[PDB]
Amino acid sequence: PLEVENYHALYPLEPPAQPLHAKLTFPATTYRATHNTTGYKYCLRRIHGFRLQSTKCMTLVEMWKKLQHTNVVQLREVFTTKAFGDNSLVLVYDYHPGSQTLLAKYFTPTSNGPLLPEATIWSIIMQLTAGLKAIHHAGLACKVLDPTKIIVTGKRVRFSSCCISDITQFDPNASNPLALVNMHQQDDLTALGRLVLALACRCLQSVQRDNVQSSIDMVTRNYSTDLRNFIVYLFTTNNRRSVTDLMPMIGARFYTQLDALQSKIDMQEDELAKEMENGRLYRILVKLNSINERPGDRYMLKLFRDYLFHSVTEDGRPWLDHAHIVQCLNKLDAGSIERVQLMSRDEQSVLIVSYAELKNCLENAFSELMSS
Template sequence: MDEAMDNLLDLPSMVDKYHSLMPLEEMQSASDEVPSAALGVRSTVLKGINMDDGGAYALRRIDGRQVLPTGELLGSSNSTMHRWGKVQHPGIVPLRRVFVSRDLEESSALYFAYEYVAAAVTVESAYLSPSPGTSPAQTQLSCSEALLWSFACQLTSVLRALHTSGLAAYPGALHPSKVLLISRSRIALGSGGLPQILAREDGSTTDTSHQLPVLMGGDLAAAGLLLLTLACGPGCSMPSLSLMARHYSADMVQLVGTLLEAGTPGGIREVGEVMHLLADHLMVEMDQVHLYSDAVQRELSKEVENGRLLRLLIKLGQINERPDLDRDASWSETGDRYLLKLFRDWVFHRSTDTGTPDLEWGNIVEALNKLDAGVPEKILLMSRDEMSMLVVSYRDLKRCMETVYSELQMKAQTQAQQAQAQAQQAHGPQPGMHTGHHRR
């Protein structure tokens, strides 16, 4: 906790146009030049809020002492960002901006602003970092085979989208510390495009037709290494297929072995070959996606209904028991407003036959839905003193509510215009305005 607080105190109030900075990983000291295992250079990740759009972004800073932020590098970085921006894929966190700033550590450095994914963690921290007091053997099977098949399908889909667009992910983007776990079973590349930029500091922005097949093979091998590392689990310094075979099926071991040999003589070279090996599991993955989509649609439909009823409740709340309007203290107690007040009591203040409050939500939802639809069904409303009873339909009540609410809106608009006119009179005519006749 003390170390985290120290990191916050060391941060500036702004970096370029980003404020409310917060470290997303343990920050290194300025004197520590240990490079990232994935990127080969020292980097820092911060969360910042963009003052232009109010959005949250993950800002990855590349140490300016290890990578000099030249104009050529900035230009090639922006070109690569635009190329990656054309690949719209749920497994790639979008890179939105590249800029240079010297607000942190008082030295110019290159920054990459990615969309911030709330609650995301790296697969390294989720599956490869043993929990305190837990032995590696106890946490070795934290990544189940079903989950590993899902990860394999997702990685294949990402690489297919990149390779068909003439791009390569580069092994650094497939390192466990750069792949994000964005939900219970979904992963995404969190540093897409960055390894390519760092690997091409000469200013070139595209890979040649000769290089691309080699890079594609490297991507497949890196995906295989990622799956192997996850399968062997935390505490395993030397992941191997033999160790993996103790806990996973022969089909999974064969897939990983095939990926590891990608790009070598006799090995696979294209992502399409991997898709043939994953055919059955791709179908399972698609079924799971549709099931999840159906569940989300059901929840969304509930929220739509909730929003519709909320609008009704707000309108009724602004009409009922209003102290006064136009200096009429009995405004909400007369005419259509009185009917709406009795309806409110009938819906929310019911009692059972024994006199206890009726707290059944179903009756309330049913009554509000009928009011919203304006059905012709009639109900009996009783005054609070039980001296009078009124028979009225939901259709009539809906008409009353719309009429009264329109009255409120018109009154609010009129008062706002009057207040604006009074303010203009109080401040006098504005400069440049003609207030009288011109003298001849």
């Protein structure tokens, strides 16, 4: 299995994907792949020997593809295929690199590992809550919510494979569908509460039906009263629950998170401003190379091309400076007033040109070439 219909270059993720419970476990596996047309790297998940029962399910998927939230791993497309040798349904998601499952992050062996700092638990709470708000608004339920089902790429938290579980369990013909999405949506909120308690305890089996109440008691000792009420709110099942209702409990923290994100944006704003250089170089040289090969002005650029890479040390040895080439190209891109002296292969001719002028020669030459 090296080819799939709309993709190729598949690579197996680890750990191997868990087999999924429909009624009978359908062995299922998730893969790194590469798009055939663009060469983009995506993530695709195969569930073995599965065919969608009705077309209506397709409507449900369309909702899933349609949804777009930063806190949800994007669903890109879904197709049924026989290429693997067991005809199967594969879902393609965006591939987020170096990500590990939240289970992997925090529950792998103050218990197993130093109990999570409160600060972190809220940042998680805000991301997960945001995703849920987006999902529920979009008239969907996560369906399954638990440590394996959420992935953390760097500091970001994302609902990794939410659509799958909904697809597998869906009824094409359902008595009150919208009434059922309602119970499902609530379930998530109960499941959200169960998750965060596992986090605050940083022991997965704290959530145990038996254990939970003492686990809650622990939470309040080591963490704030707010985090308590939050967790206690999600657990009081009797009442209808909303992502909105959690809002005053997170409370003013939103400003800390909102504020943090802006300085991350300012962080990368600087980085990006520096590394933007690489781009200009790649592009400026690409214009120049295309110009040099294809056929006065053309000769001028060609002499300049010799200036950069045709160099010879007094002896006859080459003089390739990497740094010099970068400087000259940057000056060329800037179109600086400063002038360089070009020498023709003939001894007599010598050319004096401003970079700004030379940049024009390239700019003029390219446009005509594109035009033709």
